[PDB]
Coordinates of C-alpha atoms and ligand atoms in Angstrom, one line a residue:
Chain M
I1 CA 68.5 214.4 70.0
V2 CA 65.2 212.6 70.0
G3 CA 65.2 208.8 70.3
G4 CA 69.0 208.6 70.9
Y5 CA 71.2 207.1 73.7
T6 CA 73.5 208.8 76.3
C7 CA 77.0 208.9 74.9
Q8 CA 79.7 207.2 77.0
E9 CA 81.5 209.9 78.9
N10 CA 83.8 211.9 76.7
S11 CA 83.4 209.4 73.8
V12 CA 82.7 212.3 71.4
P13 CA 85.7 214.5 72.2
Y14 CA 85.3 217.1 69.5
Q15 CA 81.8 218.1 70.6
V16 CA 81.5 221.6 72.1
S17 CA 78.7 223.5 73.8
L18 CA 78.1 227.1 72.9
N19 CA 77.0 228.9 76.0
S20 CA 75.7 232.4 76.6
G21 CA 74.7 231.9 80.2
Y22 CA 72.8 228.8 79.0
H23 CA 73.5 226.2 76.3
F24 CA 71.9 227.2 73.0
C25 CA 73.9 225.4 70.3
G26 CA 76.6 222.8 69.6
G27 CA 79.8 222.8 67.5
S28 CA 82.9 220.8 66.6
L29 CA 86.6 221.4 67.3
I30 CA 88.6 221.1 64.1
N31 CA 92.0 222.3 65.4
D32 CA 93.2 223.7 68.8
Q33 CA 91.9 227.1 68.2
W34 CA 88.9 226.8 65.9
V35 CA 85.3 225.6 66.2
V36 CA 82.8 225.2 63.3
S37 CA 79.1 225.6 64.0
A38 CA 75.9 226.9 62.3
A39 CA 75.6 230.6 61.2
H40 CA 72.2 230.5 62.8
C41 CA 73.9 230.1 66.2
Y42 CA 75.5 233.6 65.8
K43 CA 75.5 235.7 69.0
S44 CA 77.8 238.7 69.8
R45 CA 79.6 237.0 72.7
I46 CA 79.9 233.2 73.1
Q47 CA 81.7 231.1 75.7
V48 CA 82.8 227.7 74.2
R49 CA 82.7 224.7 76.6
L50 CA 84.8 221.7 75.8
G51 CA 85.4 218.4 77.6
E52 CA 81.7 218.2 78.7
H53 CA 79.5 215.3 79.4
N54 CA 77.0 216.6 82.0
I55 CA 76.3 220.2 80.9
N56 CA 75.1 221.1 84.5
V57 CA 77.7 219.4 86.8
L58 CA 81.5 220.2 86.8
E59 CA 83.0 216.7 86.3
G60 CA 86.6 217.7 86.0
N61 CA 87.5 217.7 82.3
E62 CA 85.9 221.0 81.2
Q63 CA 87.8 223.7 79.5
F64 CA 85.7 227.0 79.2
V65 CA 87.1 229.4 76.6
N66 CA 85.7 232.7 75.1
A67 CA 85.3 233.2 71.4
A68 CA 87.6 235.8 70.0
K69 CA 86.3 236.0 66.3
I70 CA 82.9 234.7 65.4
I71 CA 82.7 234.5 61.6
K72 CA 79.4 233.6 59.7
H73 CA 79.7 232.7 56.1
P74 CA 79.3 235.8 53.8
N75 CA 76.4 234.3 52.0
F76 CA 74.4 232.9 54.9
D77 CA 70.7 233.7 54.3
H78 CA 68.6 233.3 57.4
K79 CA 65.3 232.8 55.4
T80 CA 66.4 229.6 53.6
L81 CA 69.2 228.7 56.1
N82 CA 71.3 228.2 53.0
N83 CA 75.0 228.3 53.9
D84 CA 74.4 227.7 57.5
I85 CA 78.0 227.5 58.7
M86 CA 80.1 229.7 61.0
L87 CA 83.7 229.5 62.2
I88 CA 84.7 230.5 65.8
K89 CA 88.3 231.4 66.8
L90 CA 89.0 230.9 70.5
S91 CA 90.8 233.4 72.6
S92 CA 93.5 230.8 73.4
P93 CA 94.3 227.4 72.0
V94 CA 92.8 224.6 74.1
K95 CA 94.8 221.7 75.5
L96 CA 94.2 218.7 73.5
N97 CA 94.0 215.3 75.3
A98 CA 92.0 212.2 75.5
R99 CA 88.7 214.0 76.3
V100 CA 89.2 217.1 74.0
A101 CA 90.2 216.4 70.5
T102 CA 89.8 217.4 66.9
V103 CA 87.6 215.9 64.1
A104 CA 88.9 215.8 60.5
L105 CA 87.4 217.7 57.7
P106 CA 86.0 215.7 54.8
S107 CA 88.2 214.5 52.0
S108 CA 85.1 214.1 49.8
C109 CA 81.2 214.2 50.0
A110 CA 79.8 211.0 51.7
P111 CA 77.5 208.8 49.8
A112 CA 73.8 208.0 50.6
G113 CA 73.9 204.9 52.9
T114 CA 76.7 206.0 55.2
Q115 CA 76.1 205.7 58.9
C116 CA 76.9 208.8 60.8
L117 CA 77.0 209.8 64.5
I118 CA 75.0 212.9 65.5
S119 CA 75.4 214.3 69.1
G120 CA 74.1 217.2 71.1
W121 CA 72.4 218.5 74.3
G122 CA 69.3 219.5 72.2
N123 CA 65.7 218.8 72.9
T124 CA 64.9 215.1 73.4
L125 CA 61.0 215.1 72.7
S126 CA 59.1 215.1 69.3
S127 CA 56.4 217.3 71.1
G128 CA 57.2 219.7 74.0
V129 CA 60.7 220.5 75.1
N130 CA 63.0 218.6 77.5
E131 CA 66.6 219.7 77.7
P132 CA 69.0 216.9 78.8
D133 CA 72.0 217.1 81.1
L134 CA 74.0 214.4 79.5
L135 CA 75.3 214.4 75.9
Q136 CA 73.1 212.4 73.6
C137 CA 74.1 210.3 70.6
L138 CA 72.3 209.0 67.5
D139 CA 73.5 206.7 64.7
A140 CA 71.8 207.7 61.5
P141 CA 72.4 207.3 57.8
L142 CA 72.8 209.8 55.1
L143 CA 69.7 209.9 53.0
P144 CA 69.3 210.0 49.2
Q145 CA 69.0 213.5 47.9
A146 CA 65.8 212.7 46.1
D147 CA 64.2 211.7 49.4
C148 CA 65.4 215.0 50.9
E149 CA 63.9 216.9 48.1
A150 CA 60.7 214.8 48.2
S151 CA 60.3 215.7 51.9
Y152 CA 61.0 219.4 51.5
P153 CA 59.7 220.5 48.1
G154 CA 61.6 223.5 46.8
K155 CA 63.7 224.1 50.0
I156 CA 66.8 221.9 49.6
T157 CA 69.9 223.5 48.1
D158 CA 73.1 221.7 47.0
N159 CA 74.5 222.7 50.4
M160 CA 72.1 220.6 52.4
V161 CA 71.8 216.9 53.0
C162 CA 69.2 214.9 54.9
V163 CA 70.3 212.4 57.5
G164 CA 67.8 210.4 59.5
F165 CA 64.9 208.0 59.2
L166 CA 61.8 208.7 57.0
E167 CA 59.8 206.7 59.6
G168 CA 60.4 209.4 62.3
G169 CA 61.1 208.7 66.0
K170 CA 64.8 209.6 65.9
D171 CA 66.3 212.9 64.8
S172 CA 68.2 216.0 66.1
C173 CA 66.1 218.9 67.4
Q174 CA 66.5 222.6 68.6
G175 CA 69.6 223.0 70.8
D176 CA 71.5 220.4 68.7
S177 CA 71.9 223.1 66.1
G178 CA 75.5 223.8 64.9
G179 CA 76.6 220.3 66.2
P180 CA 78.4 217.5 64.3
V181 CA 77.4 214.6 62.0
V182 CA 80.6 212.6 61.7
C183 CA 80.7 209.6 59.3
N184 CA 83.8 207.6 59.9
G185 CA 86.1 210.1 61.2
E186 CA 85.2 213.2 59.2
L187 CA 82.8 216.0 59.8
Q188 CA 80.2 215.7 56.9
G189 CA 77.3 217.7 58.3
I190 CA 76.3 220.5 60.7
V191 CA 72.8 220.3 62.5
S192 CA 70.7 223.0 60.8
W193 CA 66.9 222.5 60.5
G194 CA 63.9 220.3 59.5
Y195 CA 60.1 220.5 60.1
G196 CA 59.3 219.4 63.6
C197 CA 61.6 216.9 65.3
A198 CA 61.5 213.2 64.6
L199 CA 58.2 213.4 62.6
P200 CA 57.5 210.8 59.9
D201 CA 58.6 212.1 56.4
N202 CA 60.4 215.1 57.9
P203 CA 64.1 214.0 58.2
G204 CA 66.6 216.5 59.6
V205 CA 68.6 218.6 57.2
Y206 CA 72.2 219.4 57.5
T207 CA 74.7 221.8 56.1
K208 CA 76.8 219.7 53.7
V209 CA 80.4 220.4 55.0
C210 CA 82.3 218.9 52.0
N211 CA 81.1 221.9 50.0
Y212 CA 82.9 224.3 52.4
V213 CA 86.4 222.8 53.0
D214 CA 88.1 225.5 50.8
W215 CA 86.2 228.3 52.5
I216 CA 87.0 227.0 56.0
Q217 CA 90.7 226.7 55.2
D218 CA 91.1 230.1 53.6
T219 CA 89.2 231.7 56.5
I220 CA 91.4 230.1 59.1
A221 CA 94.5 231.1 57.1
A222 CA 93.5 234.7 56.8
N223 CA 92.5 235.2 60.5
Chain U
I1 CA 50.2 228.7 72.5
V2 CA 49.7 226.1 69.8
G3 CA 46.8 226.6 67.3
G4 CA 45.9 230.0 68.8
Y5 CA 45.4 233.5 67.3
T6 CA 47.5 236.8 67.8
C7 CA 45.7 238.8 70.5
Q8 CA 44.6 242.3 69.6
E9 CA 47.2 244.7 70.9
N10 CA 47.0 245.1 74.7
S11 CA 43.6 243.3 74.8
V12 CA 45.0 241.1 77.7
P13 CA 46.2 243.8 80.0
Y14 CA 47.1 241.7 83.0
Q15 CA 49.5 239.5 81.1
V16 CA 53.2 239.9 82.1
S17 CA 56.4 238.5 80.7
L18 CA 59.0 237.2 83.1
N19 CA 62.4 237.9 81.6
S20 CA 65.9 237.1 82.7
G21 CA 67.7 238.4 79.6
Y22 CA 65.1 236.4 77.6
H23 CA 61.4 235.6 78.0
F24 CA 61.0 232.3 79.9
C25 CA 57.6 232.4 81.6
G26 CA 54.3 234.4 81.8
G27 CA 52.3 235.6 84.8
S28 CA 49.3 237.8 85.8
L29 CA 49.0 241.2 87.5
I30 CA 46.5 240.9 90.4
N31 CA 47.2 244.3 92.0
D32 CA 49.6 247.2 91.3
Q33 CA 52.5 245.5 93.1
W34 CA 52.0 241.7 92.8
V35 CA 52.2 239.1 90.1
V36 CA 51.1 235.5 90.4
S37 CA 53.0 232.8 88.3
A38 CA 54.1 229.2 88.5
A39 CA 56.6 228.1 91.2
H40 CA 58.4 226.3 88.4
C41 CA 59.3 229.7 86.9
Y42 CA 61.4 230.5 90.0
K43 CA 64.8 232.2 89.3
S44 CA 66.9 234.3 91.8
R45 CA 66.5 237.5 89.8
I46 CA 63.5 238.3 87.5
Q47 CA 62.6 241.5 85.5
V48 CA 58.8 241.7 85.1
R49 CA 57.6 243.2 81.7
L50 CA 54.2 244.7 81.5
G51 CA 52.2 246.4 78.7
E52 CA 53.8 244.1 76.1
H53 CA 52.5 243.0 72.8
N54 CA 55.6 242.4 70.7
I55 CA 58.2 240.9 73.1
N56 CA 61.0 242.0 70.7
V57 CA 60.1 245.6 69.6
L58 CA 59.5 248.6 72.0
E59 CA 56.0 249.8 71.1
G60 CA 55.6 252.5 73.7
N61 CA 53.5 250.9 76.5
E62 CA 56.0 248.8 78.2
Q63 CA 56.8 249.1 81.9
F64 CA 59.8 247.0 83.0
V65 CA 60.1 246.5 86.8
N66 CA 62.3 244.2 88.9
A67 CA 61.0 241.6 91.3
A68 CA 61.7 242.4 94.9
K69 CA 60.4 239.3 96.6
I70 CA 59.8 236.0 94.7
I71 CA 57.8 233.7 96.9
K72 CA 57.2 230.0 95.8
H73 CA 54.5 228.1 97.7
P74 CA 55.9 226.3 100.8
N75 CA 54.7 222.9 99.6
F76 CA 55.6 223.2 95.9
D77 CA 57.0 219.8 94.9
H78 CA 59.0 219.9 91.6
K79 CA 58.5 216.2 90.9
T80 CA 54.7 216.3 90.7
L81 CA 54.4 220.1 90.0
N82 CA 51.8 219.9 92.7
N83 CA 51.2 223.4 94.2
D84 CA 52.8 225.1 91.2
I85 CA 52.2 228.7 92.2
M86 CA 54.5 231.6 93.1
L87 CA 53.9 235.2 94.0
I88 CA 56.2 238.1 92.9
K89 CA 56.3 241.5 94.6
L90 CA 57.6 244.3 92.4
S91 CA 60.1 246.8 93.5
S92 CA 57.7 249.6 92.9
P93 CA 54.0 249.7 92.1
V94 CA 53.2 249.9 88.4
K95 CA 51.0 252.6 86.8
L96 CA 47.8 251.1 85.9
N97 CA 46.0 252.3 82.8
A98 CA 44.2 251.0 79.7
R99 CA 47.0 248.7 78.6
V100 CA 48.2 247.5 82.1
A101 CA 45.5 246.2 84.5
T102 CA 44.6 243.8 87.1
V103 CA 42.7 240.4 86.9
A104 CA 40.4 239.4 89.7
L105 CA 41.0 236.4 91.8
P106 CA 38.2 233.7 91.7
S107 CA 35.1 233.9 93.9
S108 CA 34.7 230.1 93.4
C109 CA 36.0 227.2 91.4
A110 CA 34.8 227.3 87.8
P111 CA 32.7 224.4 86.5
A112 CA 33.6 222.0 83.6
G113 CA 32.2 223.6 80.4
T114 CA 33.4 227.2 81.1
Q115 CA 35.2 228.8 78.2
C116 CA 38.5 230.4 79.3
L117 CA 41.2 232.6 77.6
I118 CA 44.8 231.4 77.8
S119 CA 47.6 233.6 76.5
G120 CA 51.4 233.6 76.3
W121 CA 54.5 234.0 74.3
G122 CA 55.2 230.3 74.6
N123 CA 56.1 227.8 71.9
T124 CA 53.6 227.7 69.0
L125 CA 54.4 224.2 67.5
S126 CA 53.3 220.6 68.6
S127 CA 56.7 219.4 67.4
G128 CA 60.0 221.5 67.4
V129 CA 60.0 225.0 68.9
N130 CA 59.1 228.3 67.4
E131 CA 59.0 231.3 69.8
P132 CA 56.6 234.0 68.7
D133 CA 57.0 237.8 68.9
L134 CA 53.4 238.7 69.4
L135 CA 51.2 237.6 72.2
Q136 CA 49.0 234.6 71.4
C137 CA 45.6 233.8 72.6
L138 CA 43.4 230.7 72.8
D139 CA 39.8 230.1 73.8
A140 CA 39.5 226.8 75.6
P141 CA 37.1 225.1 78.0
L142 CA 37.6 223.7 81.4
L143 CA 37.5 219.9 81.1
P144 CA 35.8 217.3 83.4
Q145 CA 38.1 216.2 86.1
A146 CA 37.5 212.5 85.2
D147 CA 38.8 213.3 81.6
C148 CA 41.9 214.9 83.2
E149 CA 42.4 211.9 85.4
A150 CA 41.8 209.5 82.4
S151 CA 44.5 211.3 80.4
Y152 CA 47.1 211.4 83.2
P153 CA 46.6 208.3 85.3
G154 CA 47.8 208.8 88.9
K155 CA 49.3 212.3 88.3
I156 CA 46.3 214.8 88.8
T157 CA 46.0 216.2 92.4
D158 CA 42.9 218.3 93.5
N159 CA 45.1 221.3 92.8
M160 CA 45.2 220.7 89.0
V161 CA 42.5 221.1 86.4
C162 CA 42.7 220.3 82.7
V163 CA 41.7 222.9 80.1
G164 CA 41.9 222.2 76.4
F165 CA 40.7 219.8 73.7
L166 CA 41.0 216.0 73.8
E167 CA 41.3 216.1 70.0
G168 CA 44.7 218.0 70.3
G169 CA 45.8 220.7 67.8
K170 CA 45.4 223.6 70.4
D171 CA 47.1 223.9 73.8
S172 CA 49.6 226.0 75.8
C173 CA 53.3 224.9 75.6
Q174 CA 56.7 225.7 77.2
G175 CA 57.2 229.4 77.6
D176 CA 53.5 229.9 78.4
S177 CA 54.2 228.5 81.8
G178 CA 53.1 230.6 84.8
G179 CA 50.6 232.5 82.6
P180 CA 46.8 233.1 82.9
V181 CA 43.6 231.1 82.2
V182 CA 40.8 233.7 82.8
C183 CA 37.2 232.6 82.6
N184 CA 34.9 235.6 82.6
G185 CA 36.9 238.0 84.5
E186 CA 38.7 235.8 87.1
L187 CA 42.0 234.0 87.2
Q188 CA 41.0 230.3 87.4
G189 CA 44.3 228.6 86.3
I190 CA 48.0 229.0 85.9
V191 CA 49.8 227.3 82.9
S192 CA 51.7 224.3 84.4
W193 CA 52.4 221.1 82.4
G194 CA 51.0 218.4 80.2
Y195 CA 52.6 215.6 78.0
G196 CA 53.8 217.2 74.8
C197 CA 51.9 220.2 73.4
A198 CA 48.6 219.9 71.6
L199 CA 48.8 216.1 71.3
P200 CA 45.5 214.1 71.2
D201 CA 44.4 212.8 74.6
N202 CA 47.0 215.0 76.4
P203 CA 45.2 218.2 77.4
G204 CA 47.2 220.9 79.3
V205 CA 47.0 220.9 83.1
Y206 CA 46.8 223.9 85.1
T207 CA 47.2 225.0 88.7
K208 CA 43.7 225.4 90.1
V209 CA 43.8 228.9 91.5
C210 CA 40.5 228.8 93.5
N211 CA 42.3 226.5 95.9
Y212 CA 44.8 229.2 96.8
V213 CA 42.9 232.5 97.2
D214 CA 43.4 232.4 101.1
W215 CA 47.2 231.6 100.7
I216 CA 47.6 234.4 98.1
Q217 CA 45.9 236.9 100.4
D218 CA 47.7 236.0 103.6
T219 CA 51.0 236.1 101.8
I220 CA 50.4 239.5 100.3
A221 CA 49.2 240.8 103.7
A222 CA 52.3 239.6 105.5
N223 CA 54.9 240.9 103.0
Ligands
CU301 CU1 66.2 231.9 63.1
CU302 CU1 61.5 221.5 85.9

């Protein structure tokens, strides 16, 4: 998160860290045994870390759990990052409590103008890399689809939505990938891509989760 | 390397990749059993990879060797990155040949105006991160110390030298760290830090190797 603020400790209780010896992506807990993330965060083995605030200090609320099935969407295409969404089933259900909780899936697609919360332990600079310890937060609105399209000519599918500020300064970045954008209580987007991080006229683009509620549900049911 | 060109295969034969399950820093081979890198690239276990061009494909000239002693300078200070230099002794001597060779240590400090070659598998973007497969190269001059000082007020010690372009566009970046700047045949600088990557008025700053020839030699002798 570039240009964001440090989240109050465990105020984003659905946020998870995907770790393979180091933090490389984020995700969201949608029920006690399943995480949703980006298909681009695929790796053969993943340890999911829940209840985190400081990614480098054990503060006493962490639950570390291995991923048992890691399921990318059938039609994920790495060249366009179209259908960038992946489901992770945990080896064991987690114990839900104040600091580790679920986020609801969307009842419908959110309109342009909605303020959303984006969080992650991703890069905090628009140039160079600085990885933060503490979870970062950003309040940002869903952009009009025609501004998304204007910023990325020919690259936006109906499964993508821009969230951010056309002025730049504030955006998600690498390492936030796979993490949540939640707009009053429901998961509406997954961190996916954008040109640079926090550049003017280059808002971040997100996987539009309302287009996948049926896929997510069938996949959970069948697994 | 931002704004650089892909080096001809094995044209930089002293360049090594420090790997701990992934590439995280560079270094230079200065004799058949020793590598010099940045103290900031310290890790408890390191595999040194020599003879590389494509960091992700085995092309047939690679030699992978573990580090036996990893020695940071006694006075390295992580807050200012002053004395950012580290020596690595390999478990076995490597076999030197056309594609794996040594770079000479400096006979003296190079003057402002010298063109140098910088190489690495570091980040190639001034905003966001993109890690390259193929080794990257950049021709860049040593800057006047007063321009270094003007760009980083109060942060430049006599053990640092700026190399780069005040206009921005071309610079080293994260992942190049610990790698070589060679100015007609001798190692004159080690990739260390800078604000951003390739920003105007923010040239890269390098560990000034001519200040450490005696330390490097005593340390090798004693180990
Ligand atoms: Cu990719
Ligand atoms: Cu550091």
